[PDB]
């Protein structure tokens, strides 16, 4: 009978990881049942070596460096990384929620809100800082927007 | 492709099964009669004078 | 209807551990017929009947008896043990 098959089934690991001590080579031939394999496992002549997990210290170090901004230059890019459509969705949602909050709180007349909304949809503003700077410079609100 | 490569497609299909009346591997499952004894299409046994 | 008893290692373990008898019966016998036959012939109460058809073409039945009758005791009584 194959001892390693029963041992792997008992221990719930791979047969590749089941290890049989050479001191039980005599007792292997007398192994008949899974109870016998359990007895050998209890004695400690049969055990499961630990599985290998890929170490992540190198990855964590490289991830810290990438967060700081290394190893992402022109010579390290092979395909598209920035999503234009997702960027447009986020840009519209940021500007629209800001303008709608201003109109809801009453700082902007609905007509001025309409003009700003159409300019945002028409891509007049690069970013929220540009939108705020335009609002402050053209004085579309009674108090300045931070 | 008509030889050995096409021979590999004869591994899962079937034209005939065992006939209940004559016991040969000659019952056509799609035509629903036996190609040997004619069961399912003729109540009389199929046997021709040109066959020894 | 009963052809014989199965006295293999699996059948003996099932008899000692689960109160089950293993019999070889006619291939056309149903679970109802097997249960009634067991009850009539041996005067025990049948809890349930599991049936299968072996690869050699025979019907084998695992008859689990009620909780007042011993499968091992019945086997010893018939002397097929």
């Amino acid at each position: 009978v194959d001892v390693k098959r029963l041992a792997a089934e008992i221990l719930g690991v791979g047969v590749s990881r089941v290890k049989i001590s050479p001191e039980a080579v005599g007792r292997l031939e007398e192994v008949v049942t899974k109870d016998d394999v359990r007895a050998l496992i209890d004695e400690g002549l049969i055990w499961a070596e630990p599985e290998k997990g890929n170490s992540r210290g190198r990855w964590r170090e490289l991830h810290e460096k990438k967060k700081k901004g290394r190893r992402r230059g022109q010579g390290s890019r092979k395909g598209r990384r920035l999503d234009e459509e997702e960027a447009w969705v986020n840009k519209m949602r940021v500007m629209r929620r800001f303008l709608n909050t201003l109109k809801r709180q009453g700082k902007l007349d609905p007509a001025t809100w309409r003009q700003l909304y159409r300019m945002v949809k028409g891509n007049y503003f690069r970013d929220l800082r540009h939108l705020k700077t335009y609002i402050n410079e053209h004085k579309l609100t009674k108090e300045p927007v931070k | 492709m008509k030889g050995t490569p096409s021979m590999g497609k004869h591994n899962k299909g079937k034209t005939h099964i065992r006939c209940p009346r004559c016991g040969r591997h000659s019952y056509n499952v799609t035509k629903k009669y036996c190609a040997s004894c004619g069961w399912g299409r003729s109540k009389r046994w199929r046997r021709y004078n040109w066959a020894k | 209807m009963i052809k014989r008893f199965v006295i293999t290692e699996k059948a003996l373990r099932l008899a000692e551990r689960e109160n089950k008898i293993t019999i070889i019966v006619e291939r056309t016998a149903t679970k109802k017929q097997i249960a009634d036959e067991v009850q009539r012939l041996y005067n025990v109460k049948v809890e349930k009947v599991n049936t299968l058809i072996t690869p050699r073409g025979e019907k084998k039945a695992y008859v689990k008896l009620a909780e007042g009758y011993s499968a091992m005791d019945l086997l010893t009584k018939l002397g097929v043990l």
Partner: protein
């Protein structure tokens, strides 16, 4: 096949039952004249047309 019909299963059971060489006592009884059986076969070599 995993899913079988009973008639095909019974024919396979008949082939399984018949597939066996003659017993040694039969060989001794016939004085080494009956050694083989026509129903002896190997599953990989000779195929039943079940």
């Amino acid at each position: 096949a995993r899913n079988k019909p009973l008639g095909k299963k019974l024919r396979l059971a008949a082939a399984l039952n018949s597939n066996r060489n003659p017993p040694l006592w039969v060989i001794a009884k016939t004085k080494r004249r009956v050694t083989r059986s026509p129903a002896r076969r190997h599953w990989r070599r000779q195929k039943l047309k079940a």
